[PDB]
Amino acid sequence: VELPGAEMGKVIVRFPPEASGYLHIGHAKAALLNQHYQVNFKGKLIMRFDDTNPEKEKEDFEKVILEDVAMLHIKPDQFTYTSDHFETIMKYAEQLIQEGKAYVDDTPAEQMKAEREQRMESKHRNNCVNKNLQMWEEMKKGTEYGQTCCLRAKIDMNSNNGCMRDPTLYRCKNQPHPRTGTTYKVYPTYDFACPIVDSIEGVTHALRTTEYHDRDEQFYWIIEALGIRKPYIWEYSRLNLNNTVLSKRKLMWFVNEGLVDGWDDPRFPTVRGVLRRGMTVEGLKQFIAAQGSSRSVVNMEWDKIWSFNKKVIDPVAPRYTALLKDAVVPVNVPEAQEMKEVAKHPKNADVGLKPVGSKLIEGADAETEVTFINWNIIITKLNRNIVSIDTKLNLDNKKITWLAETPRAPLIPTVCVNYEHLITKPVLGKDEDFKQYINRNSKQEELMLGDPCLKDLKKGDIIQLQRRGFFICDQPYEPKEAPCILIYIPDGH
Ligand SMILES: [Hg+2]
Ligand SMILES: [Hg+2]
């Protein structure tokens, strides 16, 4: 994790998401890495909404994304909007026309694309300055002919880097902007956006994934043409997880086709779904922090992330107990007449202590005789088709959970839930599609019955059922009825 130029109190980084949907696991990495540099260098972290486009971006997701940031426990020092700088950006666009480093172009898109591939020059590239300015005021006044034009930088159509072949800087859009309204009929591209905004806002270290290394040459070009200050660009590897798709489009297919109950479904790779599934922020930051800025294309097994999480939650989760209900058998031990206040984590005493006479067990337990936990039974006989077993007792001697059917503390309606990937093929692609690797049954519910110290579970508490594994309370119990829903936390393999 070596950062060139990084001095204490002088690092300024930014997370620049566009308010067009939910944040996902990939966004969570970019954001957690930025936080890392903010925290380690006592620098500024700027959150900036990319709002250059008046269409796709909606202020409803603005709330969604801020709540997503918060639940990752990321605490930005300043919040901004690209549109805060529309006036400055346009003055730089105009500066460039004036110097002959930009030109306006009405060339139809298909033909523009074909010229770029064959490194050809546009019929407009050599417009004199006043003609460009004429076509520019056309664009600025939102006219029907200007809506067919394009503003382009004058770089190098012979470049090996497609990014240097006269990129578009400004396009014509007649939609009102949410914040600037109808003041502007023309709007900057992202490619003209980052350099100037990162420079005005003082950003020192601009993080990107390796996929966009071609843009750097173009950015430094913009930055040198204007003479503004130049941030470092710092790169890291994007997140390639098996069985996973991130595309907004492909995820909303799962939403419409009703295989997933919403954008925070625990099977979804959104920040919400991952957390609701049992991921902790500490587990995520750790796995992120083991990455640092590794820069390698690598297919990721989710279970590597869930392993870091197991190490987080295991030394702190309290151990309760649950059993089913349609495979349970009554028991009679006649030697105990009422509560033992035993611990809740066998090793760390600081987690707390929980409270636990003559009546249950389960089906699968009813066949595996002379040990109990937090407690050595020797059973009389099994009266048969098993539906009852009675026993005697004695604590002197030598691996079994049980729920006493005491009237004092009755037991809580529980549901254990389990999930697996919606996509059954790990590393899928090679012009294939996911739409036909669907784990068409991806959820199972199993009605159960749990220890009374489950009456008090809050949504988000992480416990450990004994003999089953780690769970997360999806919804609490409340006095029909409403069960305490517990979701199975993958432990990584
Ligand atoms: Hg264009
Ligand atoms: Hg490019």
Measured in Å, residue 138 CA sits from the centre of ligand 1 at 15
**Under a CB-based contact definition with an 8 Å cutoff, are residues 328 and 363 in contact?**
yes
Beta-carbon contacts of residue 443 (< 8 Å; ≥ 6 apart): 267, 417, 418, 419
Ligand nearest to the CA of 189: 1
Measured in Å, residue 107 CA sits from the centre of ligand 1 at 7
What are the C-alpha distances in Å from 356 to residues 144, 331, 409? 78, 17, 8
Whole-angstrom distance, CA of residue 137 vs CA of residue 236: 41
Measured in Å, residue 473 CA sits from the centre of ligand 2 at 46
Paired tokens of 121: 């020059």
Experimental technique of record: X-ray
CA dihedral 93, 95, 100, 106 (to 10 degrees): 30
**Under a CB-based contact definition with an 8 Å cutoff, are residues 5 and 227 in contact?**
no
Ligand nearest to the CA of 191: 2
Measured in Å, residue 271 CA sits from the centre of ligand 2 at 29
Whole-angstrom distance, CA of residue 189 vs CA of residue 193: 6
**Under a CB-based contact definition with an 8 Å cutoff, are residues 146 and 104 in contact?**
no
- How many other CB atoms sit within 10 Å of the CB of residue 127? 20
**Under a CB-based contact definition with an 8 Å cutoff, are residues 412 and 451 in contact?**
yes
**Under a CB-based contact definition with an 8 Å cutoff, are residues 204 and 231 in contact?**
yes
Measured in Å, residue 166 CA sits from the centre of ligand 1 at 10
Whole-angstrom distance, CA of residue 177 vs CA of residue 359: 68
- How many other CB atoms sit within 10 Å of the CB of residue 221? 18
492 closest CA partner among 309, 318, 319, 274: 309
Measured in Å, residue 110 CA sits from the centre of ligand 1 at 10
Sign of the alpha-carbon dihedral angle for 365, 368, 370, 371: negative
Match 């098993």 to its residue by tokens: 386
Beta-carbon contacts of residue 252 (< 8 Å; ≥ 6 apart): none
First-last CA distance in the chain: 27
* Pairing outcome for strands 443-450 and 322-324: antiparallel
Measured in Å, residue 88 CA sits from the centre of ligand 2 at 24
Ligand nearest to the CA of 151: 1
- Name residues with Cβ closer than 5 Å to ligand 2, which is an ion: 163, 214
Paired tokens of 455: 């009456």
Paired tokens of 288: 């992120």
- How many other CB atoms sit within 10 Å of the CB of residue 231? 23
Measured in Å, residue 109 CA sits from the centre of ligand 1 at 6
Sign of the alpha-carbon dihedral angle for 224, 230, 236, 239: negative
Phi, psi of 165 (to 5 degrees): -90, 70
Whole-angstrom distance, CA of residue 126 vs CA of residue 123: 8
**Under a CB-based contact definition with an 8 Å cutoff, are residues 253 and 310 in contact?**
no
Resolution in A: 2.5
DSSP bridge partners of 212: none
Ligand nearest to the CA of 168: 1
Measured in Å, residue 170 CA sits from the centre of ligand 1 at 8
Ligand nearest to the CA of 216: 2
Write b or e for each residue in 179-216: b if 16 or more Cβ atoms lie within 10 A of its Cβ, otherwise e.
Answer: bbeeebbbbbbebbbbbbbbbbbebbbbbbeeeeeebb
Give the residue extent of every domain in the chain: 11-82+189-237, 83-187, 238-316, 317-324+412-489, 325-411
* Pairing outcome for strands 299-300 and 240-241: parallel
Whole-angstrom distance, CA of residue 76 vs CA of residue 66: 10
Measured in Å, residue 164 CA sits from the centre of ligand 1 at 15
Measured in Å, residue 106 CA sits from the centre of ligand 1 at 7
Whole-angstrom distance, CA of residue 392 vs CA of residue 376: 10
Checking phi first, is residue 65 left (phi over 0); if not, alpha (psi -120 to 50) or beta? alpha
Measured in Å, residue 362 CA sits from the centre of ligand 1 at 69
SS (H, E, C) 56-92: CCCHHHHHHHHHHHHHCCCCCCEEEEHHHHHHHHHHH
Number of helices (H), then strands (E), belonging to the chain: the values are 11, 25
Q: Where are the alpha helices (DSSP H) in 150-236?
A: 190-200, 215-226
Backbone discontinuities in the chain, residue before each (C to N > 2.5 A): 338, 356, 359, 368, 370, 375, 385, 398, 479
